[PDB]
């Protein structure tokens, strides 16, 4: 019944600048000595949680000097002095005082890097899939920033809605770029009916929408 609320839900910080994730508990986590029962965990993209801070301020083993917990009582602040590309992921605060053992909301750290542009590639359907009775055309957007992008599918210059599903990787822990994969799926017969299938990509880094197309069908 101890609730942990973290202040910045999402944070984009430039490489070299400081971040300050804040945490708050309904009840004081203090003990007689003065130590607080708070621990900080970092879940990197794709990995399991790691331990950063324990007992409010003590760094874990292998945790760089940048990570530094502080605070007493109910309010607590995890500070990273110099954010780097590796620091991407969602951060949590945990109370160990009163046996509910409740975590915090979570907080995504994102690296505000240089505006980049998607390397757009388009893949026509496999011969095996056509034999299977379905056809899937893939569009790939590789290593771009920011995350926000638009990928519209146009068959014979006719925008198509409801036949595609897209997926976006998380920020690369090295170059802080994203990648996107959109898959237009439809019947084998419906794929024979139309000719050209194009993937129109809209991004901030691009001057104008970029379109890629294959024409067999």
């Amino acid at each position: 019944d101890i609730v942990m609320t973290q202040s910045p839900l999402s944070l984009s910080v430039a490489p070299g600048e400081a971040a300050s994730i804040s945490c708050r508990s309904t009840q004081s986590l203090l003990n007689r000595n003065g130590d607080n029962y708070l621990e900080w965990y970092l879940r990197r993209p794709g990995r399991s949680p790691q331990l950063l801070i324990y007992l409010g301020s003590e760094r874990a083993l292998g945790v760089p000097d940048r990570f530094s917990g502080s605070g007493s009582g109910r309010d607590f602040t995890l500070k990273i002095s110099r954010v780097e590309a590796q620091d991407v992921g969602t951060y949590y605060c945990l109370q160990t005082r009163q046996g509910a053992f409740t975590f915090g909301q979570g907080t995504k750290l994102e690296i505000k890097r240089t505006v980049a542009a998607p390397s757009v590639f388009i893949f026509p359907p496999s011969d095996s899939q056509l034999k299977s009775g379905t056809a899937s055309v893939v569009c790939l957007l590789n290593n771009f920033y920011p995350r926000e992008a638009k990928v519209q599918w146009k068959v014979d210059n006719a925008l198509q809605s409801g036949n595609s599903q897209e997926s976006v990787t998380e920020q690369d822990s090295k170059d802080s770029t994203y990648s996107l994969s959109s898959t237009l799926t439809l019947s084998k017969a419906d794929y024979e009916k139309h000719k050209v299938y194009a993937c129109e990509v809209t991004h901030q880094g691009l001057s104008s929408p970029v379109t890629k197309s294959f024409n067999r069908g």
């Binding site: 003990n31 965990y41 399991s48 949680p49 975590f103 893949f123 899937s136 990648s179 898959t183």
Partner: protein
């Protein structure tokens, strides 16, 4: 060099029982507390319970009714059982090792080691094997020196699918995208890799898909 390995039920039908077990390699279970922590968007990050080497247990009140933590120091493996699995029990599950230090009170120094994670899906759907299709390089796929190819894991249930390239040799530029859940209730996933265009034809690129719930491991060749 401490390794915590998790196995158990990856797919449950509603009201059935969850079994998850963590084998510790490297250290004896003696001297630590052992906790199961689950993660889901509905529940967030949630503490289920911890266990001792003696057998003493601490549970969350909500899950106390249907949770049983066990331990076997000789076999160096502890387990969590969750009964009457509901749609709120579908989550990723981790096992952790607490680090504790005694100064007139058991103080806790954090969960130093965590597990790989085991996705547990609560659904009535039957296990379906994936279909692997090659996304091939072409003039459209190539962009200057960089060339793009891919492997499409079309239709599978439940979620766990692992994709490696060239039997793990190729990790440079390998992007495995999060899967998408189709209207049909099955998943779809794409893994791609950006190689130098000169490598096409001469090099041999293969994508290894492994869907353990269906016991389906396929190696597919990507030909330009």
């Amino acid at each position: 060099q401490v390794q915590l390995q998790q196995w158990g039920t990856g797919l449950l039908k509603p009201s059935e029982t969850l079994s998850l077990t963590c084998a510790v390699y490297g250290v004896s279970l003696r001297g630590y507390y052992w906790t199961w922590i689950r993660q889901s968007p509905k529940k967030g990050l949630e503490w289920i319970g911890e266990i001792d080497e003696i057998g003493r247990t601490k549970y969350s009140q909500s899950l106390r009714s249907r949770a049983t933590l066990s331990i076997d120091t000789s076999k160096k493996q502890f387990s969590l059982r969750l009964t009457s699995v509901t749609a709120a029990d579908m989550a990723t599950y981790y096992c952790a090792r607490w680090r504790l230090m005694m100064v007139d009170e058991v103080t806790r120094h954090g969960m130093d080691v965590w597990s790989q994670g085991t996705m547990v899906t609560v659904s009535s759907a039957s296990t379906k094997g994936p279909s692997v299709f090659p996304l091939a390089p072409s003039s459209k796929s190539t962009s200057g020196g960089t060339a793009a190819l891919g492997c499409l894991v079309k239709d599978y249930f439940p979620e766990p699918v692992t994709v490696s390239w060239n039997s793990g040799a190729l990790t440079s530029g390998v992007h495995t995208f999060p899967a998408v859940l189709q209207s049909s209730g099955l998943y779809s996933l794409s893994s791609v890799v950006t190689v130098p265009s000169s490598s096409l034809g001469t090099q041999t690129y293969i994508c290894n898909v492994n869907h353990k719930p269906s016991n389906t491991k396929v190696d597919k060749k990507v030909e330009p």
